């Protein structure tokens, strides 16, 4: 799964 803290940040898996 992905963590995405803002709309324009890249997701971290």
């Amino acid at each position: 799964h992905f963590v995405q803290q803002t709309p324009k940040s890249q997701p971290t898996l």
Partner: antibody
Amino acid sequence: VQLQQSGPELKKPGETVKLSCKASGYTFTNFGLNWMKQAPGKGLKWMGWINTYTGESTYADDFKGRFAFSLETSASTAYLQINNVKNEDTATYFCARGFYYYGSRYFYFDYWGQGTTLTVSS
Amino acid sequence: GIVMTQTPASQSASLGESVTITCLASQTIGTWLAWYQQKPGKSPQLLIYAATSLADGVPSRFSGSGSGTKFSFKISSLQAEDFVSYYCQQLSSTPYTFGGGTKLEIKR
């Protein structure tokens, strides 16, 4: 869920401050933390933010140089450091949680700290 | 980067009346827009997100409208507690600019 900030700070010109923002009630690394400045009779200014999962900090143009965000993840705490303080730093500082996640439709700041005062004086 | 203009700076009204505050964005901002209240000596508190959505536990009198660049915030019948400051904020691209704020005061 709470954001709890450290107490009032008194600093002489040229000193350093470090102020904390403790989050509780949720997984700390899920959401990022935003820092705002409010000068005495003035409006809110967004200084930048820190990714709580990644450690990557982003600074607004007016806050490059003397300003440094950091994390102590095990104590669920974010910090704001201002180096070489001057008269213009006298203000109240707030942290706020950025509510967003992967697949979210919405973005806003839901929880805010109670704010912390910095006063610069010789 | 992107400027948020909030008129007017000061607004006079009375108990039970309704008021409307504007906020004009410099660029198209979609609906990535929030409204906050700030009482004297306290921190901001979210009232409206996504331009039109009421935050949880916030009273029915508060509402928001708009999308693109033109945005409004309405209170439908004012109580004593309401006469404080309000800020809009753009959440589309960094830096996430706040409006300059409006203070509601009581007419006499």
